[PDB]
C-alpha cells in the first residue's frame, strides 16, 4: 500500500562495473592474459613408405606352424593361387595400394624377400626423399623366424638358403628422428623392447621415450599370430590398412555365426569410401567417428594431439590400431604401440559400431538384388547427438568431458545434421572457457573456420555465436580468420538481412578482436568498409558499446583508418554517445575518439583533433571512474603529441592547451586513487614530476569479459526480510507513545578522535554505528557487542574535511557514502568487515563547505555548499543530470532530500533563509521563506516524519527550531527555543514523532514533535578545556527510538527511551 513510498526498489552501484572481492578488474587493471596449450603447429607429413615382405612361399619357417587348415591369405590374396614369384608381386602391389588409400601423396617402395643390404638401401633412400618428413617402415616376417631377445629382425640371403638376422640398431641408424614402424610378425614386442634399449635413458618425462620414434607391433613377446582360417595371416596389417573389410568379415564369423549373411557381399559393398551418402562411405564415416571418439576419451590432450591430429596417416593407423586391439585380442594376441595407449577394447562405443555394422549388413542382401538406392542413412549420428544433449542438460558441470564431442565434430562435415550439431556445440561452448578449450582440443577450429564460407543464412546466427565464444577465450585466432577472409563473414552480419542487436554486438565484438593490434586485420577490415558499416548503425547500449570499441581498435595507431574516420564524420556520430546514460557507452566512445588522435596552422586534422580533445575534456569531470580513466588515457595520447605546447601552458598556469593542463591537475587530485595516479602519469609525460610510458586503455579488455561468460532467490529473501522489519518498526515508531529519554547512556565510547567526533550514522538493520573524525577517518563501532568492526582513512590527501555519511541500498547490502567538504564523494563496499573495504566509486560533486544528501528513491544525490547552485547527480547513470540555481546569493548550510517524495528537496541557508525545490520541474524553486528571524545560518533541517511535504527543519544557530508546513502557510506551525544561541546540531527522526538538538555549550535537549521536552543530556568534559562546543553528531536510528551523540572531546555516546 502507501508505505511502499518508504521502501524503494531502486538499487544503485551494484553493476558489473562496480565489481567486488576477487576482481578489481572493473577498469584500472589490464585484461587477463592467456597462455594456450593447444599449439602443435606442424601438420606433419609421412612423405615416404618402405614396404618389406619376408614371406618365403611354401617354405614355412621352423618355429611352429603345425595346423592343417592354417591361415595364409595376405593382402587379401591366396598366395597358393599364383605360384611364388607372381603371388609375391601381387601381394606387394595390393598392400601398397592398401596403404596408399590412407596417404596417397607419399612415395611407396616395396621390397620382396630382401637381403640385409637391400633393406639398408631401402631405408637409406627413404631418408633422402623425406628429410624432415616422416618415414613409414612396414615389416612382415611370416615366412622368416621370430624376432629375437637380442633385438633382431630376420631377412634373407640371396640364394634363400639362410635366414639372416638384421639388428634393430641398424634399422634405427638408417631411418632417423621422424619415423614410424609397423611389425606384422609373431613375437613383435621383442622388437619394441629392443627399440627402448637402443638409446640412453633420459631426454623425456613420460614412460620410457625420447625420440620421435613410433612403433606398432602385432602381438606380445610370448605370442604367435593366429593360424585359424577365420583370420588371414595378414590380420594386423589388414586391420591397420583395410579396417572396414576386416571389421565386417570378423563380425560375420564371430557374432551372427556367418551362415545367414553371405560373407562375399562384404567385397561387393556398394559406394565408395568418400561418399557419406553411399553405404560404404557412410560405414567408413561411422568407423572413423567411432574410433576417433574412443581415442579422445581414453587418451590425454597431448598424446591424442600427437597420434590422432598431427599426421593424417599416423592418425589413420592409430585409429585403425584400435580395431587391431579388439580383433587380435579374440585370437590370443595383444598388440602394443610405443606410445603405449590405455586399453580401448570393450569400450562402450564399439557397441554403437556393432549396432551400425549389423544394421548395414542386413541391408546389404537387398541392395545387391537391385541397385535400388534405398540406402537408409544410419541413425548413429542422430543417436549420439541426442546423448550429447542429455549431457548438456543433466550433468552440465566439469564432471568429466561429454564423450560425444569428437562425434559432434564429424557431424559438421556433412549438411545432414550440421545445424543441430552447431547448435549443440554452441550450447556447449556457452558453459565457459573450459568447454571452448575442450572443443579446440578435439580439433573443431579449422572446420568451424571453413563454415565461414557457407552462404546458408540458417547457419549464420549460430556461427557468429560459436566464434564469439572462441575469440572470447583465444584472441590469437585473429590471424587465421583474416588469412581465410572470415572477417568478411561478420561484416555482412553487421549489414544484416537478419535482425537482433544482441547478435550484432557479437559481430562487432568478433571484428574488434580480429582487428585488435592486427595491422593486416585493420587493413582487411578497412578495405571492407567496416568504418562505413559501423557508422551507419550510429544514426541498444551493448551494441553502441561494441560499435565504438570496433571503430576504436580499427583507427588505433593506423593513420590510414584515422583519415577515413575524419572524412566519414566519425567524430560527429561518436560525440553524442559521450552523453549516453550508460558509463560503458560513454567510456567506449571516449576510447574511440581517443584512438582517432596521432604556432597557428589549420589542416583537416587539426580541426578534428581540437574538436575531439574539446569533447573529451568535457567528460573529464564525469560521475563514473570508468569514463574518467578512458579520458585520462586519451589525454595521455594527446599529451604525447603536443608536449611542447603543453609544457608552455604549464609554465603560465603555475587556447585549447590551457584547458588540457587544468584537466591533468584535476585528474591528479581525483577522489578515485587509480584515476588520480592516471592523472599523475599524464603529468609526467608532459614533464611535471619511450611510448611505453603511455598508460593503456582498459574499457575494451573489461567489456570482452561479457562474452567470455555464459549467455536470485537468496537476494529477494534478505530483501523481504528487512522490508518486514522496516514496515513493522515504521508503524511502531509512529504509534508508540514515546515516553521520556533514559539519561543513563548505553555507551560512552572513546573513538580516540583527538580532536573529536564530527559526524555519525546508525545502521537500520544491525547494531552498528559509523563515526567520522575531522580528518575523515572512519570507525565502525558495534553497540551490541561493544567491539570495533573496521578502521579507515577515507582518502590519503593532506587537505581533509568530513561533510556527510549516508547509506545507499539499505535494503540489500549497504554501501557507505562519505562526502567531504571539498565536494568529493566516496562510496565504500564491505565497510563493516575487519579490513576488506573496497572503494566502489568516487566522483567530485560540485564543479566551499560542501553539503550533501542522498535520495535512495530517485537515485539522486544532491550536493551544494558555498556555491550559487544545487548540483544534481543521478547515480544510476553516474552523470551530472542538472545544475539548479539556488537563487539565494549566500551559501547552502544544510540540505535534506525527501525520502518519500523523489525530486523534492529542502535547503537551509547561511542567512537563515529556507527553500523548497522540486528538481523535476522547469522552475525548480518551489518556495522561499525566512522562518526564525535571527540572521544566522541554518545548522540543520529535515522533512517531518510522514507522507506530507511539511518540515521540522530550521534549527538555526540562534537556538530556535521552527516547525512549518509549506502547503498552507509560510509562518511557523510551532516554535521551540532549544538553546540560547550556539545551536550546533539537529536530529530529526525518520518515522517517530521526535527530534533532538545540540548546543555548543554542553547540552542535548530531546523534544516531541509537538514541543514537549522529552529529555536533557549534559555532555560533561573529561579535562578542563571546557570545549564541548562541537556537539556535532546527533542522529536517530531509522527504525528505532535510539539517539547517538558526540562532541569536541572524544566520546560517541548512545541513549534510548526506556
Amino acid at each position: 500500500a502507501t508505505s511502499m513510498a518508504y521502501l524503494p526498489q531502486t538499487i544503485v552501484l551494484c553493476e558489473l562495473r562496480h565489481d567486488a572481492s576477487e576482481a578489481s578488474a572493473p577498469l584500472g587493471t589490464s585484461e587477463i592474459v592467456l597462455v594456450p596449450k593447444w599449439r602443435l603447429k606442424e601438420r606433419m607429413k609421412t612423405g615416404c613408405v618402405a614396404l618389406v615382405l619376408c614371406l618365403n612361399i611354401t617354405v614355412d619357417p621352423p618355429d611352429v606352424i603345425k595346423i592343417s587348415p592354417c591361415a595364409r591369405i595376405e593382402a587379401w590374396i591366396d598366395p597358393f593361387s599364383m605360384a611364388p614369384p607372381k603371388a609375391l608381386e601381387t601381394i606387394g602391389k595390393n598392400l601398397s595400394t592398401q596403404y596408399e588409400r590412407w596417404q596417397p601423396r607419399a612415395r611407396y617402395k616395396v621390397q620382396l624377400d630382401p637381403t640385409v643390404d637391400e633393406v639398408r638401401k631401402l631405408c637409406l633412400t627413404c631418408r633422402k626423399y623425406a628429410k624432415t618428413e616422416r618415414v613409414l617402415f612396414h615389416y612382415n616376417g611370416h615366412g622368416v623366424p621370430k624376432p629375437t631377445a637380442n633385438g633382431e629382425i630376420w631377412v634373407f640371403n640371396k640364394s634363400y638358403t639362410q635366414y639372416i638376422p638384421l639388428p634393430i640398431s641398424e634399422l634405427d641408424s638408417w631411418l632417423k628422428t621422424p619415423s614410424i614402424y609397423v611389425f606384422d610378425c609373431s613375437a613383435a614386442r621383442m622388437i619394441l623392447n629392443a627399440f627402448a634399449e637402443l638409446h640412453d635413458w633420459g631426454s623425456s618425462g613420460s614412460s620410457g621415450s625420447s625420440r620421435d620414434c613410433i612403433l606398432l607391433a602385432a602381438c606380445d613377446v610370448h605370442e604367435t599370430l593366429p593360424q585359424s582360417v577365420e583370420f588371414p595371416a595378414d590380420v594386423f596389417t589388414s586391420c591397420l590398412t583395410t579396417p572396414i573389410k576386416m571389421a565386417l568379415k570378423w563380425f560375420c564369423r564371430r557374432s551372427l555365426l556367418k551362415e545367414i549373411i553371405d560373407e562375399s557381399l562384404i567385397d561387393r559393398i556398394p559406394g565408395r569410401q568418400n561418399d557419406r551418402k553411399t553405404l560404404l562411405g557412410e560405414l567408413n564415416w561411422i568407423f572413423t567417428a567411432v574410433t576417433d571418439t574412443i581415442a579422445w576419451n581414453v587418451l590425454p590432450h597431448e598424446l591424442f594431439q600427437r597420434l590422432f591430429r598431427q599426421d593424417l596417416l599416423v592418425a589413420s593407423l592409430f585409429r585403425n590400431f584400435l580395431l587391431a586391439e579388439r580383433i587380435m585380442r579374440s585370437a590370443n594376441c595383444n598388440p602394443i604401440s610405443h606410445p603405449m595407449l590405455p586399453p580401448t577394447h570393450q569400450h562402450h562405443m564399439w557397441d554403437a559400431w556393432d549396432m551400425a555394422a549389423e544394421i548395414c549388413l542386413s541391408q546389404l542382401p537387398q541392395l545387391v538384388l537391385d541397385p535400388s538406392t534405398e540406402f537408409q542413412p544410419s541413425p548413429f549420428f542422430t543417436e549420439q547427438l541426442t546423448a550429447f544433449e542429455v549431457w548438456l542438460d543433466h550433468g552440465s558441470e566439469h564432471k568429466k568431458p561429454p564423450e560425444q564431442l569428437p562425434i559432434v565434430l564429424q557431424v559438421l562435415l556433412s549438411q545432414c545434421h550440421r545445424f543441430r550439431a552447431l547448435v549443440l556445440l554452441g550450447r556447449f561452448l556457452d558453459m565457459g572457457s573450459w568447454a571452448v578449450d575442450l572443443a579446440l582440443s578435439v580439433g573443431i577450429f579449422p572446420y568451424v573456420l571453413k563454415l565461414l564460407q557457407t552462404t546458408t543464412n540458417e547457419l549464420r546466427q549460430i556461427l557468429v555465436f560459436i566464434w564469439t565464444k572462441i575469440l572470447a577465450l583465444d584472441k590469437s585466432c585473429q590471424i587465421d580468420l583474416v588469412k581465410d577472409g572470415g572477417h568478411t563473414y561478420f561484416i555482412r552480419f553487421l549489414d544484416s538481412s537478419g535482425a537482433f542487436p544482441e547478435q550484432r554486438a557479437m559481430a562487432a565484438f568478433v571484428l574488434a578482436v580480429i582487428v585488435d593490434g592486427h595491422r593486416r586485420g585493420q587493413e582487411a577490415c578497412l578495405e571492407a568498409n567496416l568504418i562505413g558499416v559501423c557508422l551507419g548503425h550510429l544514426e541498444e547500449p551493448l551494441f553502441l558499446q561494441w560499435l565504438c570499441l570496433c571503430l576504436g581498435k580499427l583507427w588505433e595507431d593506423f593513420m590510414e583508418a584515422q583519415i577515413m574516420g575524419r572524412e566519414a564524420n566519425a567524430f560527429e556520430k561518436l560525440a553524442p554517445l559521450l552523453s549516453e546514460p550508460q558509463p560503458e557507452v560513454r567510456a567506449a566512445a571516449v576510447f574511440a575518439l581517443g584512438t582517432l588522435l596521432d604556432e597557428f596552422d589549420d589542416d583537416e586534422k587539426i580541426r578534428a583533433e581540437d574538436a575531439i580533445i574539446k569533447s573529451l575534456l568535457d567528460v573529464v569531470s564525469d560521475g563514473s571512474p570508468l569514463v574518467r580513466a578512458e579520458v585520462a588515457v586519451a589525454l595521455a595520447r594527446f599529451a604525447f603529441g603536443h608536449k611542447q605546447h603543453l609544457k608552455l601552458a604549464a609554465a603560465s598556469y603555475w587556447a585549447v592547451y590551457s584547458q588540457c593542463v587544468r584537466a591533468m591537475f584535476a585528474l591528479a587530485k581525483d577522489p578515485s586513487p587509480r584515476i588520480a595516479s592516471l592523472g599523475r602519469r599524464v603529468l609526467s609525460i608532459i614533464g611535471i614530476e619511450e611510448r611505453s610510458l603511455l598508460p593503456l586503455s582498459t574499457i575494451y579488455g573489461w567489456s570482452c569479459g561479457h562474452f567470455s561468460k555464459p549467455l536470485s532467490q537468496e537476494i529477494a529473501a534478505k530483501r523481504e526480510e528487512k522490508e518486514k522489519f522496516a514496515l513493522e518498526h515504521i508503524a511502531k515508531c509512529q504509534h508508540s507513545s514515546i515516553s521520556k529519554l533514559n539519561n543513563n547512556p548505553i555507551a560512552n565510547w572513546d573513538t580516540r578522535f583527538e580532536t573529536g567526533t564530527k559526524t555519525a550514522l546508525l545502521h537500520p538493520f544491525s547494531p552498528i554505528v559509523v563515526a567520522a573524525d575531522e580528518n575523515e577517518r572512519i570507525r565502525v563501532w558495534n553497540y551490541e557487542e561493544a567491539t570495533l568492526l573496521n578502521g579507515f582513512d577515507n582518502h590519503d590527501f593532506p587537505d581533509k574535511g568530513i561533510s556527510k555519511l549516508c547509506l545507499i541500498n539499505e535494503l540489500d547490502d549497504s554501501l557507505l557514502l562519505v562526502a567531504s567538504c571539498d565536494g568529493s564523494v566516496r562510496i565504500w563496499k564491505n565497510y563493516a568487515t575487519k579490513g576488506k573495504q573496497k572503494l566502489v566509486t568516487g566522483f567530485s560533486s560540485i564543479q566551499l563547505n560542501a553539503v550533501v544528501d542522498w535520495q535512495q528513491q530517485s537515485g539522486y544525490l544532491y550536493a551544494s555548499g558555498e556555491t550559487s547552485t544545487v548540483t544534481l547527480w543521478d547515480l544510476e547513470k553516474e552523470q551530472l543530470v542538472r545544475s539548479v540555481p539556488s537563487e539565494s546569493e549566500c551559501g547552502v548550510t544544510a540540505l535534506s532530500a525527501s525520502q518519500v517524495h523523489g525530486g523534492q528537496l529542502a535547503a537551509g541557508f547561511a542567512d537563515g533563509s529556507l527553500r523548497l525545490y522540486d528538481v523535476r520541474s522547469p522552475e525548480p524553486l518551489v518556495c522561499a521563506t525566512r522562518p526564525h528571524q535571527k540572521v544566522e545560518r541554518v545548522v540543520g533541517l529535515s522533512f517531518q516524519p510522514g507522507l506530507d511535504p511539511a518540515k521540522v527543519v530550521s534549527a538555526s544557530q540562534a537556538g530556535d527550531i521552527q516547525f512549518l508546513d509549506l502547503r498552507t502557510t509560510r509562518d511557523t506551525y510551532l516554535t521551540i527555543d532549544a538553546h540560547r544561541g550556539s545551536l550546533t546540531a539537529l536530529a530529526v527522526h525518520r518515522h517517530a514523532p521526535i527530534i533532538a538538538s545540540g548546543s555548543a555549550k554542553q547540552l542535548i535537549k530531546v523534544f516531541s514533535l509537538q514541543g514537549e521536552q522529552l529529555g536533557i543530556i549534559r555532555y560533561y568534559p573529561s579535562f578542563m578545556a571546557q570545549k564541548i562546543g562541537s556537539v556535532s553528531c546527533l542522529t536517530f536510528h531509522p527504525y528505532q527510538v535510539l539517539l547517538a551523540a558526540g562532541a569536541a572531546d572524544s566520546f560517541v555516546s548512545i541513549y534510548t527511551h526506556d
Binding site: 601438420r43 557419406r276 564429424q410 562435415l413 572446420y447
Partner: peptide, 8 residues
C-alpha cells in the same frame, strides 16, 4: 588441407 573432409 584438412584431416577430415568437409562438404561446404
Amino acid at each position: 588441407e584438412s584431416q577430415f573432409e568437409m562438404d561446404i
